[PDB]
RNA sequence: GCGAAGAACCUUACCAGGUCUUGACAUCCUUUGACCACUCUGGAGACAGAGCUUUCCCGGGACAAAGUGACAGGUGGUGCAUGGUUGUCGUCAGCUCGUGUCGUGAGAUGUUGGGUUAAGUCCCGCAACGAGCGCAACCCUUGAUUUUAGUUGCCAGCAUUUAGUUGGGCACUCUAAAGUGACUGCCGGUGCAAGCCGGAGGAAGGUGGGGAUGACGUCAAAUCAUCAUGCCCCUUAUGACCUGGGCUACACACGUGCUACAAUGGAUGGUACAAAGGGUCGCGAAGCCGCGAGGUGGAGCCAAUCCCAUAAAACCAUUCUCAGUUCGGAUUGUAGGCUGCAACUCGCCUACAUGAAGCCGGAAUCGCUAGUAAUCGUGGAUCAGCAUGCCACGGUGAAUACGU
């Protein structure tokens, strides 16, 4: 009855950190569904390349954000403590 | 005439409509993005340096 | 100076009802701004007038209308030293059909009646009877080309 | 012809951007805090040959690591200069700041450190031709497969500016699996302003 | 059974095939309405006309996405992939008309400095 | 204010003429607010309105009610070519 | 009928200068017997070491006339920029006529 | 339709008037340590005169009160003094070096000659043998497919619901991580070899489609106004504050766009089909009101969940009947809405009425090779409000390429 939301700019941290939760959660809360790859949200920022003139020459940048989902059916008394103890590094945001 | 202008923008104005946005590093008024609060020039020069998280050059 | 020469050609799909290639190539010729429904519909209904006015065969009469306006000769001008000479030359098999539909529709717009529906249907009637503007222009091409028969191959 | 920034071309492809933190609705608030942190570090540690600084932010805690070629001034016998950082950063960060210091092995392979050592000689009235050549032959012993450097500006006191570059090795800019470092630095002279550009094709 | 999910442009068409009379069902709606053009109607039966099975099977279609012509193309690919599952003996017949191929044409991307995919702003000499 | 919540009248301009009803066109009013709609109370008064570099006097009529002060103080100085 | 347009930068486009440019480039009409009306782009600029520059573009239909000169004073450049322009009109016109006459 | 990804005040760099001189912005001086904010009066405001309070915390401090200095401040000049950044030839296939050799020498060779290629890409020959920057590949995206995963996504087979609704299941699509796949790989002919032509397999065949990627250099190309900076210049002002005006002028000339000159059309009624994005001092539904722009209302949503958000051309019926018109909408009078302290100079939208030029455009000239041109809608940045501009998304969807 517990859901986990994970977002990150780089999925390498995300996928590795997501796996850490899955192994730890099943230790106590064995009822754990697999991670769900929610759609990624992207944004573009086109910018004039020069300083003064030349509007025809531009440059484009992007920002792709990846999201995951962890679901638990039957929790355990230590499952919340296990989730609390597992502190993911920076670059990934968790949300219970 | 820019040090006076930056200081003027910092303090609260008479009415909420006089307020506007200015680039934090350099201080040019035109073409500022309020996601980063940088102008189009400081945004490019500093994104190359790998200091804006998430931002990368876009091929597609 | 550049370019490798021969290139591939587009395909044509067999339309229903009036299964033909000229009909499908005629629909796309008089279509504007990619509105297939507008251009296709006026052709299908136009064949009704062909049947009601002079009912022989909608598939036919249209046929010899094409084989009466397609040119046999052609002129491809070239510039020689001092003066430009209009060189007569034959017409290829593919451009034989292309120059027919274009001449049919250019002068179907200039006919001068209420609707394009009537104008296109009437024009092929005149061509099927060796009359009209479309037939007239082909004779101009033949008269000019055969007038310069001298330096045809030379 | 204008060249793309060699570092910027490789962000997220083979390397990783320096400041690595995630936040929403606090992006511009956090981002300009980092620009303030870097400005102070580059001020006090001007002579410590500091090259790479990254920000590691997690739940109101700021973690920063300093990559130094010569950490002896930054930490060591004194054992009290590094703690002044956390005392001189709490006023503007207002957050519990922890700082880490990391040795840089083979400091000649880092394009940042090579840049100012070339630069510092230019205002020492050293000829531009000698300064670049000395650095090129120093880095080749370190294990790099390529180096080319230029110095541009009012060159040697000349009225008309021009650029001069020296190369030996392999510096493929267009290759994306290259791992090429980059640095640009200012040489403050009494005849004008000079800039040095250095890029090194590292080993792996 | 006989799932032949096929695609065209931005359209995806999942088709399940069953033997029957020949009725075509699209989103619980008669196929005379969803496809108005008879010209667009013939192309639906091309996989069913190369092999003589037109009056033998019923198609249940749950298409979603793309323009009205887009579903017409995607449903032609839908039946052919499902029909090929019915019997592999039809592969040389359908391959001759190029019906197994999924068309690779997609609308391009706009480019900066251009008014579309390839349109260029008017050039003035002086 | 071009809405139901209007009209808009400048305070310091409105108050000055209000106490000038005793004068009854005996004093010129020197004001800068051009964004004030002309009220019925203003009728018969003469006001000097700043046109960007100086003050230009205008005598208020009945027909001028509902308009702005600046409408009768042209700014750009055009004299043909 | 020629229509002029002088882009005076780092200099003032005085009326005597305008008349000098207009009358000197106006004699080109004798050559090209029908000059279709077109816009002339003229640029003037002076350095710190007393050098004058003139650039002229006269986009006739098939004739793209250009010439750019650097000399001591402003008037010498304008008088010396006719020679570069007159050559191109004589070059282009006599190239067309004599070649098609083998 | 260039800096400007938003000029009503601010922006603003200009003008008129009204003001200040260690100053609007930082350091070091010295006494208190909070300093203010607010109300009233004169106020166009800046600012002038009074009262309430200024509670610092821990001898430290940052700011503030007070006058002084060192000093500050210039969007003032020079882009022919410069750093950095960018355009252009041009994504054109070239530009050089090490050692050797030839020549008195500048120079030459390699890089030429015969084939081939998109390509100094490759093969053979050769007084040359090799290398570097360029080309190609490595990167992203689209097109086919396997495993992992079923939520906020999907509904095969089901029972129920006004409605995939609810119960139920990942069957299929779907989303995203890891892999397979295209590499002249194979076959036939041709050639000596590079290679070339055709064919099979495949979703895809000859660098598949499209991007990112721009060599030595040329134009003393552009930018001292994004930032930095040598020299020169100003400093009771070329620095600083406020209100108002202007950057929106107008006999005219040029460039770039939007709308039209109608019947493949206008008007009226019904109805179907998307992709890509935004939303917390934010999006804003149902309901009610108004002809309308809009008003009240507050649901749900920190979002594969809710909102923006009914896609338009297209399709189906009636009418108009070739006219300056039931085409076209400029222009103008009146009455309104919305943002904002404020819409006169100078904003956008709505209702009624007025109804202009225009019936395909001279000389000349521009773009485009396939999901392209053409045409129709949609979204986002800047943004209180304001785009016919810019940057992206999808729907329908051509003609032609003999040839140099
Ligand atoms: Mg604003
Ligand atoms: Mg141009
Ligand atoms: Mg002369
Ligand atoms: Mg443009
Ligand atoms: Mg002002
Ligand atoms: Mg007080
Ligand atoms: Mg007071
Ligand atoms: Mg220059
Ligand atoms: Mg190429
Ligand atoms: Mg040579
Ligand atoms: Mg060769
Ligand atoms: Mg090839
Ligand atoms: Mg090569
Ligand atoms: Mg072979
Ligand atoms: Mg093949
Ligand atoms: Mg390449
Ligand atoms: Mg110049
Ligand atoms: Mg200039
Ligand atoms: Mg300066
Ligand atoms: Mg302007
Ligand atoms: Mg109308
Ligand atoms: Mg108004
Ligand atoms: Mg009306
Ligand atoms: Mg008329
Ligand atoms: Mg007419
Ligand atoms: Mg807006
Ligand atoms: Zn900036």
Torsion sign, CA atoms E58, E62, E68, E74: negative
DSSP state of C53: H
User: Are residues E58 and E25 in contact, defined by beta-carbon separation less than 8 angstroms?
Assistant: yes
Q: Any chain A CB within 8 A of the CB of E112?
A: yes
User: Are residues G72 and G50 in contact, defined by beta-carbon separation less than 8 angstroms?
Assistant: yes
Q: How far apart are the first and last CA of chain C?
A: 24
Which residues of chain E lie closer than 8 angstroms to A60, CB-CB? 112
User: Are residues D40 and D47 in contact, defined by beta-carbon separation less than 8 angstroms?
Assistant: no
Q: Helix, strand, coil: what percent of chain D each, to 5? A: 35, 30, 35
Give the list of residues 6+ apart from residue D36 with CB closer than 8 angstroms, or none: D92
Number of residues assigned to chain G: 102
Distance (Å, rounded) from C-alpha D134 to C-alpha G48?
40
* Region for residue D116 given its phi and psi (left: phi exceeds 0; alpha: psi -120 to 50; beta: otherwise): alpha
Distance (Å, rounded) from C-alpha D170 to C-alpha B11?
55
Nearest 5°: CA angle at D178, between D172 and D179? 125
Residue among A8, A11, A63, A64 with most chain B CBs within 10 A, to mutate: A63
Q: What is the dihedral of CA C112, C117, C123, C126, to 10 degrees?
A: -110
**Residue C29 token pair:** 């010729």
Distance (Å, rounded) from C-alpha G51 to C-alpha G71?
6
User: Are residues E74 and E7 in contact, defined by beta-carbon separation less than 8 angstroms?
Assistant: yes
Torsion sign, CA atoms G59, G65, G66, G72: negative
* Region for residue G75 given its phi and psi (left: phi exceeds 0; alpha: psi -120 to 50; beta: otherwise): alpha
Nearest 5°: CA angle at F51, between F46 and F54? 85
Nearest nt by C1' to G38 Cα = H254
Method: cryo-EM
Contact criterion met (CB < 8 Å) for G39 and E126: yes
Nearest 5°: CA angle at D23, between D21 and D28? 95
Nearest CA to the C1' of H90 belongs to which residue?
Answer: D1
Contact criterion met (CB < 8 Å) for E125 and G41: no
User: Are residues D188 and D173 in contact, defined by beta-carbon separation less than 8 angstroms?
Assistant: no
Residue among A49, A56, A62 with most chain E CBs within 10 A, to mutate: A56
Closest of B23, B37, B44, E116 to residue A49, by C-alpha: B44
Q: Any chain E CB within 8 A of the CB of A57?
A: yes
Distance from CA of D19 to the nearest CA of A (A): 10
User: Are residues F32 and F52 in contact, defined by beta-carbon separation less than 8 angstroms?
Assistant: no
Distance (Å, rounded) from C-alpha D8 to C-alpha A60?
12
Closest of D33, D135, D14 to residue D92, by C-alpha: D33
Helix (H), strand (E) at residue G83? helix G74-99
Closest of A63, A77, A65, A80 to residue A4, by C-alpha: A80
Indicate the burial class of F38 (C-beta count within 10 angstroms; 0-12, 13-18, 19 or more): buried
Distance (Å, rounded) from C-alpha A45 to C-alpha D23?
19
3-state secondary structure of F24: coil
Distance (Å, rounded) from C-alpha B10 to C-alpha D100?
35
**Residue E55 token pair:** 């009056």
Q: What is the dihedral of CA A49, A51, A56, A58, to 10 degrees?
A: 20
User: Are residues F65 and F43 in contact, defined by beta-carbon separation less than 8 angstroms?
Assistant: yes
Max CA-CA distance within chain E? 71
3-state secondary structure of C104: helix
* Cα distances (Å, whole numbers) of residue C12 to B47, C27, C43, C78, E67: 52, 11, 17, 34, 22
Annotated binding site of B for Zn(2+): 23, 26, 39, 42
User: Are residues E8 and E15 in contact, defined by beta-carbon separation less than 8 angstroms?
Assistant: no
| C83 → chain G, closest CA residue | G100
Relative to beta strand A58-72, strand A92-95 is unpaired
3-state secondary structure of D58: strand
Give the list of residues 6+ apart from residue F61 with CB closer than 8 angstroms, or none: F43
Distance (Å, rounded) from C-alpha C120 to C-alpha C111?
8
Q: Which residues share a beta bridge with G44?
A: G8, G54
Q: Which residues share a beta bridge with F56?
A: F49
DSSP secondary structure string for all residues of G20-54: HHHHHGGGGGGTSSS----EEEEEEEE-TTS-EEE
Closest of G78, G69, G5, G65 to residue G35, by C-alpha: G65
Q: Which residues share a beta bridge with G48?
A: none
Around Cβ A31, how many Cβ atoms within 10 Å? 14
Indicate the burial class of D179 (C-beta count within 10 angstroms; 0-12, 13-18, 19 or more): middle
Around Cβ D136, how many Cβ atoms within 10 Å? 20
Distance (Å, rounded) from C-alpha B46 to C-alpha E11?
41
Distance (Å, rounded) from C-alpha E117 to C-alpha E107?
9
Residue located via tokens 């000499």: E125
User: Are residues G40 and G25 in contact, defined by beta-carbon separation less than 8 angstroms?
Assistant: yes
Which residues of chain A lie closer than 8 angstroms to B53, CB-CB? 9, 91
Q: Is the peptide bond before F7 cis (omega within 30 degrees of 0)?
A: yes
Q: Which residues share a beta bridge with D101?
A: D66
Ligand 27 ion local residues (Cβ < 5 A): B 23, 25-26, 39, 42
User: Are residues C138 and C107 in contact, defined by beta-carbon separation less than 8 angstroms?
Assistant: no
């Amino acid at each position: 009855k517990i859901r986990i939301r994970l977002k990150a700019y780089d999925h390498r941290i995300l996928d590795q950190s997501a796996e850490k939760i899955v192994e730890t959660a099943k230790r106590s809360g064995a009822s754990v569904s697999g991670p769900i790859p929610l759609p990624t949200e992207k944004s573009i920022y086109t910018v004039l390349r020069a300083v003064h003139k030349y509007k025809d020459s531009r440059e484009q940048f992007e920002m792709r954000t990846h999201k995951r989902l962890i679901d638990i059916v039957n929790p355990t008394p230590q499952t919340v403590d296990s989730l609390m103890r597992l502190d993911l590094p920076s670059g990934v945001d968790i949300e219970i | 005439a820019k040090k006076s202008m930056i200081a003027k923008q910092k303090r609260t104005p008479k009415y909420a409509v006089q307020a506007y946005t200015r680039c934090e590093r350099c201080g040019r008024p035109h073409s500022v993005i309020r996601k980063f609060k940088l102008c189009r020039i400081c945004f490019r020069e500093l994104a190359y340096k790998g200091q804006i998280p998430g931002v990368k050059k876009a091929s597609w | 100076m550049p370019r490798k020469g021969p290139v591939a050609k587009r395909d044509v799909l067999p339309d229903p009802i009036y299964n033909s290639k000229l009909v499908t190539r005629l629909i796309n010729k008089m279509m504007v701004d990619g509105k297939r429904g507008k251009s296709q519909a006026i052709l299908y209904s136009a064949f009704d007038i062909i049947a009601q006015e002079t009912g022989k065969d909608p598939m036919e009469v249209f046929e010899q209308a094409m084989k009466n306006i397609m040119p046999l000769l052609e002129v491809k001008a070239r510039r020689v030293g001092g003066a430009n000479y209009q060189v007569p030359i034959e017409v290829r098999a593919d451009r034989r059909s292309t120059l027919g539909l274009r001449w049919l529709v250019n002068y179907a717009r200039l006919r001068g009646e209420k609707t394009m529906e009537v104008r296109v249907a009437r024009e092929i009637m005149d061509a099927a009877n060796n009359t009209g503007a479309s037939v007239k222009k082909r004779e101009d091409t033949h008269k000019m080309a055969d007038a310069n028969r001298a330096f045809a191959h030379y | 012809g204008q060249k793309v920034h060699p570092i910027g071309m490789r962000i997220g492809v083979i390397r990783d951007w320096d400041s690595k933190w995630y936040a929403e609705k606090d992006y511009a608030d956090f981002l300009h805090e980092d620009l303030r942190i870097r400005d102070y570090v580059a001020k006090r540690l001007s002579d410590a040959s500091v090259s790479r600084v990254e920000i590691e932010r997690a739940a109101n805690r700021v973690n920063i690591t300093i990559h130094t070629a010569k950490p002896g001034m930054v930490i060591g016998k004194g054992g009290s200069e590094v703690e002044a950082l956390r005392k001189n950063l709490n006023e503007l960060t207002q957050k519990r700041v922890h700082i880490n210091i990391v040795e840089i092995k083979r400091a000649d392979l880092d394009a940042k450190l090579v840049a100012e050592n070339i630069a510092r000689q230019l205002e020492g009235r050293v000829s531009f031709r000698r300064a670049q050549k000395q650095a090129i032959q120093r880095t080749m012993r370190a294990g790099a497969k390529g180096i080319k450097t230029q110095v541009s500006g009012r060159l040697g006191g000349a009225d008309i500016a021009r650029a001069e570059h020296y190369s030996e090795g392999t510096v493929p800019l267009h290759t994306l699996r290259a791992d090429i470092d980059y640095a640009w630095e200012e040489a403050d002279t009494t005849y004008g302003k000079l800039g040095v550009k250095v890029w090194i094709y590292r080993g792996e | 059974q006989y799932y032949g999910t096929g695609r065209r442009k931005s359209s995806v068409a999942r088709v399940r095939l069953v033997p029957g009379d020949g009725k075509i069902v699209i989103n619980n709606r008669d196929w005379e309405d969803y496809i108005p053009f008879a010209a667009l109607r013939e192309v639906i039966k091309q996989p069913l006309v190369a092999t003589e099975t037109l009056g033998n099977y019923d198609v249940l279609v749950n298409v979603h996405g793309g323009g009205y012509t887009g579903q017409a193309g995607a449903i032609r690919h839908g039946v052919a992939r499902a029909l090929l599952q019915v019997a592999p003996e039809y592969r040389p017949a359908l391959k001759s008309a190029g019906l197994l191929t999924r068309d690779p044409r997609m609308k391009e991307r706009k480019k900066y400095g251009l008014k579309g995919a390839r349109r260029a702003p008017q050039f003035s000499k002086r | 204010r071009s809405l139901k919540k209007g009209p808009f009248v400048d305070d310091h301009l409105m108050k000055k003429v209000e106490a000038a009803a005793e004068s009854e066109k005996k004093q010129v009013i020197k004001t800068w607010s051009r964004r004030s709609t002309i009220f019925p109370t203003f009728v018969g008064q003469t006001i000097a309105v700043y046109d960007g570099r100086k003050h230009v006097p205008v005598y208020v009529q009945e027909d001028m009610v509902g308009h702005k002060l600046g409408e009768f103080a042209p700014t750009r100085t055009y004299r043909g070519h | 009928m020629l229509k002029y347009n002088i882009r005076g930068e780092n200099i003032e486009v005085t009326e005597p200068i305008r008349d000098y440019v207009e009358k000197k480039i106006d004699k080109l009409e004798r050559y090209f017997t029908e000059t279709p009306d077109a816009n002339v782009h003229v640029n003037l600029k002076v350095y710190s070491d007393k050098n004058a520059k003139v650039e002229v573009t006269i986009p006739l239909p098939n004739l793209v006339l250009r010439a750019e000169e650097t000399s001591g004073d402003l008037y010498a450049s304008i008088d010396l920029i006719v020679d570069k322009l007159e050559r191109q009109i004589r070059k282009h016109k006599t190239k067309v006529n004599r070649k098609f006459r083998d």
